[PDB]
Design a protein around this ligand. Structure first.
Ligand SMILES: [Mg+2]
Ligand SMILES: [Mg+2]
Ligand SMILES: [Mg+2]
Ligand SMILES: [Mg+2]
Lengths: 212, 211
DNA sequence: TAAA
């Protein structure tokens, strides 16, 4: 019963959703979005954060989108692969947005916040695509994010995803980079570990005096 | 400074706190009006604290847009004679110079912008640096340390005024939106978050966490 | 929903 967990209390009513995108370049406005995965989070009985629902979509390049060969070489994606099962930006985001809104309502939150590694990257691609497909009721905060690079820099003294995960004691496999799914799952587990560690060490909840 | 732990704390990144004031939300089209920068240092006990402060009022670039709602919000009159405004180039060149000195003196490799909802300030600083064709920009081209996310983790608060108050800091509504004051509160906030994690034993890491 |  999500309403009954502390999820909504932990981040002032923000519902954290982990996102990774794969793309055909670095420019959210002109380069194709090719893949997206999303993982909602939940808080267990002891107040530990953990992954909840996972969504994963392969995305058809938008009308007029550019595709940089270096990007494709990097993520190893072939936009014309039959087994891609590519759907439109609209269907992918619409399905993600539906599940996220459901989680928001079920948990007693008020909106979603994107958790991502160098989060401005994914946030911009996700916003540009939502703009393209004219999605409304976008549950994500229009500008605020939870960047795991910054968070790992604080908690672990590491900003690089693979290194942060290793330092946190997670396995990280260079072969499995870069499915959107694998990177999203490692980023979710990393983020949960950072928040849980903070609770472990007594940093949260705050003391009485810290009530203002 | 190379004998402090500053360069070891963030894998060679030299943290610089930044706040800009602007005539709108679009880094590409709206004027950059003001910017402050605060470098950090570690004391002998390993605590982070503000080091050098810089503060510039900025002349709107050629063709820049000025949204009235932004002016109303930040209280800035671009034509106030007392502004002592300088060009984007002069401001960023001076900021960049002092940051490059700090990097070399502390033994770091790159600077990383600390800012509140940092993509905002990072975008304007980068846009301006591009327009003025500044060279050897010491800031990481895409990585930031967002104090909104950091405060969300450390304090359960993402709004700057609230984060600060929660952390036991003063925060004054009247002083808000001078770049100087916002930068100073943001620096003190960021240092408190880092210092708190150290106080609680979160840093340094244990032996097992060494890879 | 607070980076102007
Ligand atoms: Mg990524
Ligand atoms: Mg990836
Ligand atoms: Mg600001
Ligand atoms: Mg301000």
């Amino acid at each position: 019963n999500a309403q009954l967990t502390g999820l909504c209390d932990r981040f002032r009513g923000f519902y954290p959703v982990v996102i990774d995108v794969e793309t055909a370049g670095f420019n959210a406005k002109t380069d194709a979005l090719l893949e997206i995965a999303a993982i909602t989070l939940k808080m267990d009985e002891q107040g530990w954060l953990m992954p909840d629902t996972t969504l994963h979509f392969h995305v058809e390049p938008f009308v007029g989108a550019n595709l940089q060969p270096e990007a494709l070489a990097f993520n190893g994606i072939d936009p014309n692969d039959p087994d891609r099962g590519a759907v439109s930006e609209y269907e992918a985001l619409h399905e993600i947005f539906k599940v996220v809104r459901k989680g928001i309502k079920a948990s007693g939150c008020n909106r979603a916040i994107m958790v991502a590694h160098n989060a401005n990257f994914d946030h911009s691609f996700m916003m540009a695509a939502a703009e393209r497909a004219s999605l409304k009721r976008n549950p994500f905060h229009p500008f605020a994010t939870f960047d795991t690079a910054a968070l790992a820099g604080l908690a672990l003294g590491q900003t690089v995803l693979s290194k942060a995960c290793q330092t946190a004691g997670m396995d990280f496999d260079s072969t499995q980079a870069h499915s959107a799914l694998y990177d999203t799952e490692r980023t979710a587990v990393l983020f949960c570990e950072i928040v849980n560690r903070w609770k472990r060490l007594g940093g949260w909840p705050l003391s009485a005096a810290e009530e203002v």
